[PDB]
Amino acid sequence: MRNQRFSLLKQPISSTLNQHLIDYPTPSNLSYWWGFGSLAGICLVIQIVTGVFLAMHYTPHVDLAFNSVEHVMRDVEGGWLLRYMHANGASMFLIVVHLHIFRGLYHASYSSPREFVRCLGVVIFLLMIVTAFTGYVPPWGQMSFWGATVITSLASAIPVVGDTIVTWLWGGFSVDNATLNRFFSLHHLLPFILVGASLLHLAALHQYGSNNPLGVHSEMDQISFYPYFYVKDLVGWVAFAIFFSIWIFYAPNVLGHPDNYIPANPMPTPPHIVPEWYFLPIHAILRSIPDKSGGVAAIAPVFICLLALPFFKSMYVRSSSFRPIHQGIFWLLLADRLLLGWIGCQPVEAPFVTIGQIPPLVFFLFFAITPIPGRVGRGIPNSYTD
Amino acid sequence: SLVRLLILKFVLSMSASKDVLALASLEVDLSSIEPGTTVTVKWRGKPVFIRRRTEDDIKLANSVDVGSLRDPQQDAERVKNPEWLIVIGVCTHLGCIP
């Protein structure tokens, strides 16, 4: 309070915006790797605005769905821009979030006191996967039918209530009009849960502030968010919109499959069923197990060892700048997630059955050889001392 | 009890409709082909597979190890004919037609 007024940004109507978006204290040495988080909140707003206008011309019926998407591309004013922004915009939303996650692994941003910020973001990554999968079915092409068949039948290897799971998810005995109608209703709903879980994920970071490239206690050198990290975030929103415009105007079909331009026929099978590029690493782990019930049970330990990183303790050094051995393991895990994506679009044959079984093992040896440096490393100040 | 009534009524409406269950059993016909080829015909929403395999196929077919099977059973019981094999065309693995 004071006795009379002052700057209007310090009034109750704009206090929550002032103290969290203008005057918020920030470490002064943050690099451009701290810019991909506001870039991911712009990619979520683009998908909501473009999809609300796409849904004014789409019909969720098996006799009318493929022809409603060609009606947008051909007869609606600017309608080809509305579709290409939405199909390619889901690839931009996954490039930005994948570079966000690998920042937090290099600088160990999951550590104390920031465990709830990590665990709220593993829930966000799960809501993004369900939303993109369920929305790839509405165009109703040959890859929108034979991809919803391969994934929803994978719940038929669960013990002995699982044959009642798949025919309740389907609404019948196969993928058909009962399945296309309920996949549309859930697809309008799940982006609005994703919005409320992103505002909650930001209230958990504004309780302790941000980490920095050195990993240290930083409260002695801090500046404000406006104008310093607003004008260098604006350099990032313009470099993004150039890169996004070479995918809409000059190459709008490079990141897709041609088989989704054939209308859906349940009598023949396509020769090769391959997902979008951003589902290729978990598709190669899922096909690496020669048992099917052990394939669903290798996807759930991917999201268990992610949710259980910030609860191992003894590591006082955070940043990989001062840690020369864990830094070399980071570049050796990134080479493995790019090799698991290559395997996930190859035939299931030799030699890709051995080269697709070792990288699922190397991927799970990253989360077990982290805590052993949490033991051998804490005896460094008693040995190297001078 | 009020939480019991509401949650069950929202989850049971997703199960299967009375018009989907009315199309679940019926009788349809096929045509002829020669020994060792393939043609399918539709029943409800999925195919009906097909084989009448040849005399070279009486070998490499049934006398392979019974203890090396994921589920061991004789060939003589899945067949009902000594050379024909035609049964509902959906793989038991993931619902794909192979």
Binding site: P159, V160, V161, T164 | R4, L8
Partner: peptide, 29 residues
């Protein structure tokens, strides 16, 4: 004391089974 803490706490595991089949009758399993 501390035994009676768990000697209580494992019957809410079972108050929850009188409850877990109370509405759904999970049948096949």
């Amino acid at each position: 004391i501390q035994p009676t803490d768990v000697k209580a706490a494992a019957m809410w595991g079972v108050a929850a089974a009188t409850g877990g089949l109370y509405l759904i009758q999970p049948w096949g399993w």
